[PDB]
Each structure stands twice: as C-alpha cells, then as structure tokens.
Amino acid sequence: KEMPQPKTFGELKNLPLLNTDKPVQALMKIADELGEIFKFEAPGRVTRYLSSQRLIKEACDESRFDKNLSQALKFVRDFAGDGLATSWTHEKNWKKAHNILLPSFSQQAMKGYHAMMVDIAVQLVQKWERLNADEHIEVPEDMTRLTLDTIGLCGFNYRFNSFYRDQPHPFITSMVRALDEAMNKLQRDPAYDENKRQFQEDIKVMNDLVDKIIADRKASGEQSDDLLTHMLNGKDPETGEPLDDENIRYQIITFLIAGHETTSGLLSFALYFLVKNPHVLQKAAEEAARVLVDPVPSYKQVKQLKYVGMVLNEALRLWPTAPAFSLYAKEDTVLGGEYPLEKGDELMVLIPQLHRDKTIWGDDVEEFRPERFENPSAIPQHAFKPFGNGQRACIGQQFALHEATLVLGMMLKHFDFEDHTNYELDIKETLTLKPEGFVVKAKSKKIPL
Amino acid sequence: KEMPQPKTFGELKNLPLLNTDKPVQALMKIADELGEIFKFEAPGRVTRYLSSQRLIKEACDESRFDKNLSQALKFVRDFAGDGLATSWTHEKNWKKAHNILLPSFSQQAMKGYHAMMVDIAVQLVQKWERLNADEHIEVPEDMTRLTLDTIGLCGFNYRFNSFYRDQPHPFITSMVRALDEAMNKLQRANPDDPAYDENKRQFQEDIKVMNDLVDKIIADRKASGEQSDDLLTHMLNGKDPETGEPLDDENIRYQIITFLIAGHETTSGLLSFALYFLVKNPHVLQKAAEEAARVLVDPVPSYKQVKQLKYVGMVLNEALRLWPTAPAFSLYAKEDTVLGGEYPLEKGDELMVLIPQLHRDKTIWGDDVEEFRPERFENPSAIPQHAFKPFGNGQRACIGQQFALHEATLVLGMMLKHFDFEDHTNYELDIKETLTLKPEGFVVKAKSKKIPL
Ligand code: HEM
Ligand code: HEM
C-alpha cells in the first residue's frame, strides 16, 4: 500500500539523485534496494518507477495506460517535433504517420532495404580488413558509423560517408549536441544561456539540411527505395491525407535520433558479450559460417541467422539501449491490487530492471545465455520489452534487428576477435546506453567479399 | 502466363478430385505442388484457386472483384434463401439486411449479447465440472452444443437445450442433414441419378422442418409483442435507412437460419482447434491460463473482462490462421482485368480464395508457417494487408466476426480458468471436412481447479 521512496534533498525532493553521470544505473541500484516500485518526486513532478514483470504487465494494458512523454521526450520534441517518437497518441499526426509508415517498416519491407544495408556493412568489413597488425577497433565508434550511414541511406538516400571521416557530418554534430543538451537539461539559471542559444543553432542545422533534401527530392521527381519516397507518395488510408513536408522532416530527424545509437549500442553490447563468453561466440561464429555461404549475404540468409538473433535479444535483455519509457493512467485504476493511481498519474518502466526479474529468468539473470530465447512462447507476457509496448512500440524494430543481424553475422564470418585489453565494462549514459572505450582486435579469416 | 492445372479425368476434367472426404486439404496439397494459382475445370465450370497474398490482395480489390456464390453457397441458398451469406451483392435484400443488421453485430452490440453467451458458457463449465474421474470430453461435440445454443439464444431467444440431450433438437438434425446433403451434392458425378431420389425427398423434408420452426417463432414473437435482447427483436423493429423498409418475415427467417448455419460450426471448430493447439503447446497453454486467471477475477466474466483477454485473442487468431473454419470464398471479375500482371481474366471469370494456403504464405509469415505461435499476433500492426482473411473481405466480410470472437474468447477464457487439460490419448489431428473444418475425434480430460461460479 505505502510506496517506497529513495532519499530526499529537502525542497528538491529526489531530483538531485538524477544529477549523476549514470542515472539509469543509479535508478537500477535504487530498485535493488526498494523493490518493484518506488515513488520519485521532484519540484512539480511525481512519477513511479516499475521494475517487476508483475506490475509492468498491467502497465502494458493499453486500455488502462497510454504512452506519456517523459521529460527526456519533451526535450527531444523541441527538435523531433511531432514525429512518431515524440508525439502523443491523440495527436492527428501520430496516427497518420503511424498508418503511412507501418508498411515500410515491415519484415517484408526489409527486403527492399537489404541491398543498402549490405552496402554499409561491406564498408565496415573492408575497414577492418584494411587495418594493420596490432591496430585495434573502437567498437561503439565504428558501430555508430555503420548505423548512422545505414539509416541515412535507407531513410532518404543520403550518404553521410562516416567511414571517410574523423569528424562526423555537420548534421550529426548538431544532432549529437542537441541530444546532449536534452539530457543535460534533465540534470539542472543564468549560466545556461549559451547552451540555450547553441541549442537553437543545432536545431536550425538539422531542419535546413533535411528540408533541403526533401525539396531536392521533390524538385527531382526521382523514386528511390528509401523512406522519403514512401512519405512523399504515401497517403493515410484513414483520413486520406499525406504527411506534410514539415512532418516528413521530423520523421527523418526522428529515425536518425531513435535509430542510430540504440542500434549501435546493441551491436556494441552484443560483441562485448560475445568476446566475454567465448563458447557463445564460437556457437554464433559457427552459424555465421554455415549460413553465409555467399560473398554477399542475402535477405533470406539473414533470416536464417537464428542464434545470432538470440544473441542480439539476450544483449537487449541485459542492456536495452532505449532503457525506459513513460506511461500515464487513462482513468483511476489500481496497480497490482495495492497501489491506487488517479487519472493522469505517471509511470516509468525501468527496462533493465524488468529484464533482471528473477521470478521470470531464474537466478542467473546476470549471465549471458542466448538460449533463453530459443523458444519464444516460453517467455511470460510483457517480460521482455526492449522495443516498448503496443501501438507505441518501436516501429523500427524489424529494421534494427535486420541490420544488426546482418552486420553481426558478417563480422562473425570474416573475423576472429580478441579482447586484448580485458576490457572492463563501463557504460556511458546519454539518452541511450553504450560500452564506452570498448576495444577489440580483429584477425581476418581471409574470406573474400 | 500459362496457368497450372491438376490431373484430369477425361471428360470430367478435374471434378473427380473433389470426390474425396478431405477436399480442402486435397486442394492445399495441389496448391503446394502448383503454386500461387491453378485452374480447376469441371463440366460447365471453370475456376481458379488463389493461394498467395500477392494475388489475393488484388482479388480483394472491391472495385475489380465482387463476391461470387460458390457451388457450395448456391446449394446452401436452397435453405438459406436470400440471407446475407447466400445473396448476391446486387440483390436488394443484401444491402437492406446489411444496413439493418450491421449495428446489431458491432463490438458495442456484444454488450447486449454477453449475458446470454455467459448462460450457455456456464452450462458448458458445469457439464465438465460434473464429469466423473477418468471420463473424458468430446471437444467438437461439446463446442457445437455451446455455439448452437448460444446463437439460438442470442438469435431468437430459443433454447435448443443441447446440454440436456444426446440426440440434438429436431431442427438441428434437419439443419445438419441439409448441410450434409449440400456438400455431398458437390461430390456427385451423376447428380440426376435415380439413386439420389431419397436424398432429394429428405432434403425437402429438412427444409420444411427448418422453415416451420423459425416461421412459428417469428409468428409467436409478433403475436406477443415481447421484446428480448436478441437479433429477432432487432429485425422485427429495424428499418433500412436507405430504402426505409423493414425486413419481411420470410427474409427474417432466412437470416435466422443463416446465423445458425454460418455461425455454429465455424465457431465451434475454432474453439476445438484452439484447445487442440493449446494442449499440444503447453507453454502457450500456461501463458493463456495465466491471463485467464488474472483477468477473470469474478465468478461470472464481465464484458470488459473478456476484452482484456488479449493473449486468448492471440491464441484464437493463430488457430484461425492455421485452420480457418470457413476455408474459402469465391469472387468474380466485374470487368475484364489482368491478375498479377500475367493472368488475363474476362468479365465474369471466377476465383476461389484458398484461405488455409494464404495463411501459409512464407513470403508474409516466414518459414515457420506450420508452427503454432500466438506471438505472431502480439502486435496486430505486424500483419500485412490481406494476409489474414479468416472472416472474408470487404463489405461481404463476416458480419458475425465480433460475435464469433467474443463468444470464443469468453468460453476459452472460462475453460482455461476452471480446468487443467490433459491430452490423454496423444490425439492425432484428423480434420473432418463438411463445408467447414473440425478436429474429428479430439478428446481431452479436464481436472477442475475447483473455482466456484
Ligand atoms: C536496438 C535498436 C532500437 C531500440 C532498442 C529501440 C527502442 C525503442 C523503444 C523502447 C521505443 C518506445 C519508446 C517509448 O515508448 O517512449 C521506440 C520507439 C520508436 N522507435 Fe525505436 N528502437 C531501436 C531502433 C529504432 C530504429 C532503427 C528506428 C527507425 C528506423 C526507430 C524508430 C522508432 C520510432 C519512430 C519510435 C516511435 C514509434 C511510435 O511511437 O509510433 N527505432 N524504440
Ligand atoms: C470463427 C467463426 C467464423 C468464421 C471463421 C466465419 C467466416 C466467414 C467468412 C469467410 C465469410 C465470407 C463468406 C464468403 O465470402 O462467401 C463469412 C460471412 C458471413 N458470416 Fe461468418 N464466420 C464465423 C462466424 C459467424 C457467426 C458467429 C455468424 C452469425 C452470428 C456469422 C454470419 C455470417 C454472415 C451473415 C455472413 C455473410 C455476410 C454478408 O455477406 O453480408 N459468421 N463468415
């Protein structure tokens, strides 16, 4: 009945607890101490962090709870606009873009994106093939190069050419700097005036380039296999309307934001867990060699990388790279028979804690065992939520998993990996999670492309 | 361009291929060999069987194709009349009954039918609670008892009382024998033979039995002025907004017979296939049983609680994917058209949509099409357009879909709440075929969880 709450700071309540550089991991430690639910109070804000499958399965009841914009999402909305990720379910542009974009994110739609994904994946393989001896790989850096270029090419036929660069494309510099400002706002004022002005400059950089590419595509009339063509030609079946040019811009910015570093973190965490578990790596490398019998992987071959898919799912279990989402109660309701909630009350789903619920996974929750996902019906309802819930779930799930399965499979086919530094896991936190400083050496198997 | 075709029998062309007791399953095997489309020729009949989402999505374009009466539907029309299921789209009584009946089949209308559905569902639960040890359940038999009584009660406030009987109500005996004669006619190479003269006389006798009882109940209700929460009251009081007309007494009779035909064994087969798949996949059963116990917290389920049985709904949809109990429907080309960029069709040319094959299209569902995984339906947004058609297409889709799904969700949830199930014979799936599909001889044991009603 009475809900636990972590330590307070007078008038600031729990807010100073977020003024730390690893807030998700700090919230996980609080969940370890306080349990499946604790109240988090701040000036003008009350929310509740859920950590158990028992309560989260009720929170995922769409008749009782809808997606809420967290403070992070509200700050991201300042440059993601009413794109899919930062719009409310009741906003006209959400259901519109949802209906329009759903067919182009289907498993069937990945057949059309596969050739472009392979283009970038080959560039990653060739970079590592061309490294000199005793040089090493900066894993999250290269994974981010790959995912950024993949979404640029599949999103609107634009080549960031990240593998030709030390300093990222100017759009990426502004996007990354905007996301950093969004998170820093969470942890904060006269001194922040230059940050605020800088925020507007980065917003202008993103809008200008995306608007230009849309105008360029409209001026050309060319049809590509990218999401931009689908949005310029698609019509919402419900209202009969197409997305306007401003919303198309926000959707493109959204795909870059929501997709690039979540997916690059997944690949980085997956490789980290593989090199720390050599038996799992060997099993995944065995499948990659048996399945990828051609110089270039096909769409059908990527679907055959079953164990690689389980590896990615287990990496998402331990460290989901979009580590939380927010919900609000549509009406007065009681959560788990003992926590009354009023209409509008907010919830936070702490995904990494959910995925460590020993009542679901057993005692070995910290062990990396892809075999947990061998049979998907053995997993209880709402126990595994790395991509959100319901109609507000990740629209790019199939995109992210297809790219990550293709790239990891190619990595495992072409290289053996060495954890040459005995890397100590250090998780840097932005709005997403990544293993900072993770490095490996790759010895080529000398298999041609 | 050139269309495949199965083996022929001289002058009879492909027709003898249907003279088998599992024709849908035989047509699926032909689809496995020949692909997404094959021509089927008979004396005086040519049709084409579609199996791929690629072609079926075009056949479902209502601007190009309209519902055709299959030969099965034409034979059912001899006792279903111009009811909704056996009338052409251009017949005045279709759009009339469609406009009148659509509001009474909506999800909002299920709130009014819920109490009557619970009545029969409790009778089923009570029957199984009262079984002795090591006695067993005949699953399709009991599911048919439930669906027949539910549509009887919700349709026109009549109790067949099937759970008080070994031999069904005389109306049910005549209806089943009429449906059996309809299917047997499909498989007769010499239908005008003198031997089937007793079949023809019996067929007319069964037609008379059905009309007499339904006409009597309509007259009985009109003479009393009683108002119930059934479809018969809605049809006696409803007026088509378009023409301003109500349904006449003859059409109301045909609609009532239609609800019984189109609804009873399609729905009972779904429940039977669902329970079969649950006992063969214990992980799915546990997941569905957990939801039933958590959601159905009252002795009697409410309408709102049934809507919360999401995973039970996923189980039913996956059961409908593998074995849709109304396994085909027919279409005709409104004008000359080209199907799939290679199959030129002329005005009036007929198509058959082989639904179980559509639901096994690996280009849509992946390689694991034969596996029972309700998780495919966890997010309904993952299913492409026209890939999943257990209830038909467009304005000629199943009007009773919400009814069927509410009934099935309620009953399966109550079954999972009150009993553990054992596949005590390791039942080997054997699908008996009439105009619908059912797992013949499927039996289970139920051990009660001792939860009162
Ligand atoms: C491993 C990689 C990814 C993970 C873990 C992930 C995670 C998530 C999560 C948890 C949500 C729900 C957020 C909420 O409820 O507030 C979400 C939504 C979303 N994601 Fe992803 N995502 C990934 C990749 C991608 C990619 C590649 C794209 C685009 C190509 C994308 C686009 C979106 C969009 C548009 C939404 C909002 C959908 C809607 O609300 O209608 N994500 N994602
Ligand atoms: C799981 C159960 C059911 C399934 C799979 C099913 C399937 C179908 C299919 C495939 C059609 C289209 C037939 C065609 O196009 O020729 C149809 C039509 C129809 N069904 Fe159902 N049905 C079910 C339950 C019911 C129930 C419970 C009722 C009545 C209460 C019902 C009444 C009708 C009617 C009236 C039509 C014709 C609608 C029209 O054409 O206007 N069905 N059904």
DSSP assignment of B63-127, as one string?
A: TTEEEE--HHHHHHHHHHTTSGGGS-TTSHHHHHHHHHHGGGGSTTTHHHHHHHHHHHHHHHHHH
Q: How far is CA B74 from the centre of its chain?
A: 17
Residues pairing with B291 in the sheet: none
What is the SS3 assignment for B362? helix
Distance CA B192, CA B195 (A): 8
Q: How far is CA B367 from CA B99, B235, B445, in A?
A: 41, 47, 33
Tokens (6 digits) for B210? 């059905």
The experimental method is X-ray
CB B273 within 8 A of CB B291: no
**Residues with Cβ within 8 Å of residue B347, at least 6 apart in sequence:** B333, B334, B335, B336
- Specified resolution (Å): 2.0
Tokens (6 digits) for B41? 């020729």
CB B286 within 8 A of CB B293: no
Identify the active-site residue in A65, A79, A325, A387. A387
Backbone phi, then psi, for B388, in 5-degree steps? -130, 100
Comparing C-alpha atoms, which of A436, A432, A411 is closest to residue A128? Answer: A411
Distance CA B120, CA B411 (A): 9
Tokens (6 digits) for B338? 């080209």
Residue holding tokens 């009542």? A359
Residues pairing with B45 in the sheet: B42
**Residues with Cβ within 8 Å of residue A69, at least 6 apart in sequence:** A77, A86, A88, A326
Distance CA A273, CA A442 (A): 16
In chain A, residues with a C-beta closer than 8 Å to the C-beta of B281 are 377
Distance CA A29, CA A6 (A): 10
Whether A303 and B375 lie within 8 Å, measured CB to CB: no
Query: Residue A250 is which amino acid?
Result: Y
Tokens (6 digits) for B273? 């296939």
Pocket of ligand 2 (CB under 6 A): B 67, 73, 84-85, 98, 151, 258-259, 262-263, 266-267, 270, 324-326, 329, 390-392, 396, 398-400, 403-404
Q: How many CB atoms lie within 10 A of CB A150?
A: 31
* Distance in Å from the first CA to the final CA of chain A: 61
In chain A, residues with a C-beta closer than 8 Å to the C-beta of B367 are 303
Name the residue of A394, A398, A408 to mutate for ligand 1: max ligand atoms within 8 A of Cβ.
A394
Helical ranges in B323-423 per DSSP H: 355-358, 362-365, 401-418
Tokens (6 digits) for A113? 């994106």
Q: How far is CA B380 from CA A110, B74, B348, B387, in A?
A: 18, 34, 35, 12
Q: Print the SS3 string covering chain A.
A: CCCCCCCCCHHHCCHHHHCCCCHHHHHHHHHHHHCCEEEEEECCEEEEEECCHHHHHHHCCCCCEEEECCHHHHHHHHHHCCCHHHCCCCCHHHHHHHHHHHHHHCCCCHHHHHHHHHHHHHHHHHHHHCCCCCCCEEHHHHHHHHHHHHHHHHHHCCCCCHHHCCCCCHHHHHHHHHHHHHHHHHCCCCCCHHHHHHHHHHHHHHHHHHHHHHHHHHHHCCCCCCHHHHHHHCCCCCCCCCCCHHHHHHHHHHHHHHHHHHHHHHHHHHHHHHHHCHHHHHHHHHHHHHHCCCCCCCHHHHHCCHHHHHHHHHHHHHCCCCCEEEEEECCCEEECCCEEECCCCEEEEEHHHHCCCHHHHCCCCCCCCHHHHCCHHHCCCCCCCCCCCHHHCCCCHHHHHHHHHHHHHHHHHHEEEECCCCCCCCEEECCCEEECCCEEEEEECCCCC
Antiparallel, parallel or unpaired: β A439-444 and B343-345: unpaired
Q: How many CB atoms lie within 10 A of CB A220?
A: 9
Backbone phi, then psi, for B352, in 5-degree steps? -120, 130
Tokens (6 digits) for B347? 């005005």
Helices B71-80 & B249-280 angle (0-180, nearest 10): 130
Q: How far is CA B156 from CA B106, B239, B256, B398, in A?
A: 17, 18, 8, 19
Residues pairing with B445 in the sheet: B422
What is the SS3 assignment for B411? helix
Antiparallel, parallel or unpaired: β A346-350 and A45-50: parallel
Question: Cα(B268) to centroid of ligand 2, in Å?
Answer: 13
Tokens (6 digits) for B287? 């997941």
| Nearest chain A alpha carbon to B364 | A108
CB A234 within 8 A of CB A94: no
Tell me if A400 CB under 6 Å of ligand 1. Answer: yes
Measured in angstroms, the CA of B380 and the nearest CA of chain A are apart by 9
DSSP one-letter string for B248-303: PHHHHHHHHHHHHHHHHHHHHHHHHHHHHHHHH-HHHHHHHHHHHHHH--SSS--H
Residues pairing with A270 in the sheet: none
Give per-residue burial for B381-392: e unless 16+ CB within 10 Å, then b: eebbebbbbbbb
Distance CA B95, CA B99 (A): 6
CB B245 within 8 A of CB B100: no
Annotated catalytic residue B266? yes
Surface-to-core class of residue A446, CB atoms within 10 Å of its CB (0-12 exposed, 13-18 middle, 19+ buried): exposed
Sketch the domain layout of chain B as residue ranges: 1-453
Tokens (6 digits) for A275? 């090199």
**Residues with Cβ within 8 Å of residue B386, at least 6 apart in sequence:** B53, B56, B57, B60, B393
Q: How many CB atoms lie within 10 A of CB A118?
A: 22
